[PDB]
């Protein structure tokens, strides 16, 4: 049973992702996050190998939750008459990247490099597992403040990774690419790279680069903060208007700006502790 296995704590938050409570696993006091979503509020449904009807979020989480990674793992899930309940890892202490940047302002490039690298490795993991997140952004990244490790959250907008065109999108608009704005069409990997460019800009400038559709499709990138020439180049490459002009993940990680990355623990010691 659900209620015998987990001690539920206060509400952490709620929104389009359902209602998430702090909890602990009774067996070993493991900190967890307990996410509830009403069945009537689930738009995207899938099926598990054994043929169970579940939210697509569960399908995608199962696919990425094997072994260690920079994704928050699904530990268990339960079906109730009118809802699903997901048990997820919970770092402690933790802060999401949106709150971190809001509080501390634009990040030093050494810290942005460490964080961005970790996000790249996490998104590679997802893609390797056949999962497209589709909502990569500061709010969907948790920082484990003691370990210096970033963790991807909220697969509620995700999809199975495919090589053909996507014509649906329920992620965050300002992180959405110009081909979506113009044509309601995108491909998975190149749209992901766009969102990563937005994220990197957000890290080093302290705010996102575009607010309105006309800026997104204009793709003129103006920098509000001092950012190194190498970092500006990478950002501008990720934010190329034409999807085919954007770097691959390999190209991003081989970029001069991405060299000499700090390990998570040294990141924590230098920047977080
Ligand atoms: C802007 N926010 C706070 C969006 C949070 C999105 N979000 C965080 C979480 C998670 C956690 C949260 C960690 N702090 C939170 C505050 C509010 C809501 C959730 C959390 C967590 O520890 N593990 C998580 O998976 C989450 C889980 C499923 C779906 C969406 C989720
Ligand atoms: Cl809900
Ligand atoms: Cl690597």
From Swiss-Prot:
Keywords for the protein's UniProt record, in alphabetical order: Apoptosis, ATP-binding, Cell cycle, Cell membrane, Cytoplasm, Host-virus interaction, Kinase, Magnesium, Membrane, Metal-binding, Nucleotide-binding, Nucleus, Phosphoprotein, Proto-oncogene, Serine/threonine-protein kinase, Transferase, Ubl conjugation
Tissue localization of expression: Expressed primarily in cells of the hematopoietic and germline lineages. Isoform 1 and isoform 2 are both expressed in prostate cancer cell lines.
Segments forming domain Protein kinase: 6-258
Changes after translation: Autophosphorylated on both serine/threonine and tyrosine residues. Phosphorylated. Interaction with PPP2CA promotes dephosphorylation.
Gene Ontology terms describing biological process: apoptotic process; cellular detoxification; cellular response to type II interferon; negative regulation of apoptotic process; negative regulation of DNA-binding transcription factor activity; negative regulation of innate immune response; positive regulation of brown fat cell differentiation; positive regulation of cardiac muscle cell proliferation
Required cofactor names: Mg(2+)
Family annotation (Gene3D superfamilies): Phosphorylase Kinase, domain 1 (3.30.200.20), Transferase(Phosphotransferase) domain 1 (1.10.510.10)
GO molecular function, one term: protein serine/threonine kinase activity
GO terms under cellular component: cytoplasm; cytosol; nucleolus; nucleoplasm; nucleus; plasma membrane
Domain of life: Eukaryota
SUPFAM superfamilies for this protein: Protein kinase-like (PK-like)
EC identifiers of the protein: 2.7.11.1
Induction summary: By interferon-gamma (IFNG). Strongly induced in leukocytes by the JAK/STAT pathway in response to cytokines. Induced by different cellular stresses, heat shock and cytotoxic agents.
Function: Proto-oncogene with serine/threonine kinase activity involved in cell survival and cell proliferation and thus providing a selective advantage in tumorigenesis. Exerts its oncogenic activity through: the regulation of MYC transcriptional activity, the regulation of cell cycle progression and by phosphorylation and inhibition of proapoptotic proteins (BAD, MAP3K5, FOXO3). Phosphorylation of MYC leads to an increase of MYC protein stability and thereby an increase of transcriptional activity.
Family assignment from sequence similarity: Belongs to the protein kinase superfamily. CAMK Ser/Thr protein kinase family. PIM subfamily.
Known partners and oligomeric status: Interacts with RP9. Interacts with HSP90AA1, this interaction stabilizes PIM1 protein levels. Interacts (ubiquitinated form) with HSP70 and promotes its proteasomal degradation.
Record protein name field: Serine/threonine-protein kinase pim-1
Organism: Homo sapiens (Human)
């Amino acid at each position: 049973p659900l209620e015998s296995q987990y001690q539920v704590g206060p509400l952490l938050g709620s929104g389009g992702f359902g209602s998430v409570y702090s909890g602990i696993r009774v067996s070993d006091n493991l900190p967890v996050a307990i996410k509830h979503v009403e069945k009537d509020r689930i738009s995207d449904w899938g099926e598990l190998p054994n043929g169970t009807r579940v939210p697509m979020e569960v399908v995608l989480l199962k696919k990425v939750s094997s072994g260690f990674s920079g994704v928050i793992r699904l530990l268990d899930w339960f079906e109730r008459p009118d809802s699903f309940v997901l048990i997820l890892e919970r770092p402690e202490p933790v802060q999401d990247l949106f709150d971190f940047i809001t509080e501390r302002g634009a990040l030093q490039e050494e810290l942005a490099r460490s964080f961005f690298w970790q996000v790249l490795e996490a998104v590679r993991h997802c893609h390797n597992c056949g999962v497209l997140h589709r909502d990569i952004k500061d709010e969907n990244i948790l920082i484990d403040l003691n370990r210096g490790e970033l963790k991807l959250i909220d697969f509620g907008s995700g999809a199975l990774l495919k090589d053909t065109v996507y014509t649906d999108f329920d992620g965050t608009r300002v992180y959405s690419p110009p081909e979506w704005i113009r044509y309601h069409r995108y491909h998975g990997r190149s749209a992901a790279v766009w969102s990563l460019g937005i994220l990197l800009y957000d890290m080093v400038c302290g705010d996102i680069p575009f607010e309105h559709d006309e800026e997104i499709i204009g793709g003129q990138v103006f920098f509000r903060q001092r950012v190194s020439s190498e970092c500006q180049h990478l950002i501008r490459w990720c934010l190329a208007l034409r999807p085919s002009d954007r770097p691959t993940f390999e190209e991003i990680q081989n970029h001069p700006w991405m060299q000499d990355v700090l390990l998570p623990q040294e990141t924590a010691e230098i920047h977080l502790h």
